[PDB]
Amino acid sequence: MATYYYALASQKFLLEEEPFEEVLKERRRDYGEKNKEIDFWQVIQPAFLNAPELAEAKAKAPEKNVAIVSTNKSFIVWVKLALEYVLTGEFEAPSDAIPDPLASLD
């Protein structure tokens, strides 16, 4: 099991008002340059948020949501600093509650 860090926003905010697709893409390009394994993702309507131990974040979260997830904590700190309007946290996977950390409910 690895520790996954996340920043969670509403779909409206992270897909429409402040879309991150190019940020992620340019980061994939920098990783390709150095042959680094990709360790970050966008997950729309993440199934991780239905996990019993994230119930609090589920209560706080907008109904239609989306996360940037990464095993690199400092990336997520950077996303949080850049975006502001996000929930953040961490979890462990895979587990019974979180079989696939990247699974979408949508």
Numbering used by the authors: 1 to 106
From the paper:
To investigate the structural basis for these effects of the A9G and R82A mutations in Synechocystis, crystal structures solved by molecular replacement against the WT Synechocystis Ycf54 were obtained for these two proteins to resolutions of 1.5 Å and 2.2 Å, respectively. Superposition of the A9G and R82A models on WT Ycf54 resulted in respective RMSDs of 0.19 Å and 0.28 Å over all Cα atoms, showing that there are no significant structural alterations between the WT and mutant structures. Upon closer inspection of the R82A structure, differences are observed in both the local hydrogen bonding network and surface electrostatics. In WT Ycf54, R82 adopts two clearly defined conformations, both of which form stabilising hydrogen bonds with neighbouring residues. In one conformation, R82 forms a water-mediated hydrogen bond with the side chain of W78, and in the other R82 forms two direct hydrogen bonds with the backbone carbonyl of F20 and the side chain of E17. All of these interactions are lost in R82A, which may alter the stability of this region. Examination of the surface electrostatics shows the base substitution to alanine changes the surface electrostatics from predominantly positive in WT Ycf54 to predominantly negative in R82A. It may be that the flexibility of R82, along with its associated positive surface potential, is required for docking of Ycf54 onto CycI and consequently mediation of the cyclase reaction. The structure of Ycf54.R82A, which has impaired Chl biosynthesis, ∼50% reduction in CycI levels and abolished interaction with CycI, reveals that the R82A mutation has reversed the normally positive surface electrostatics to yield an overall negative face. The rest of the R82A Ycf54 structure remains unaltered by the arginine to alanine substitution; therefore, it is reasonable to conclude that this residue is required for Ycf54 to form a stable interaction with CycI.
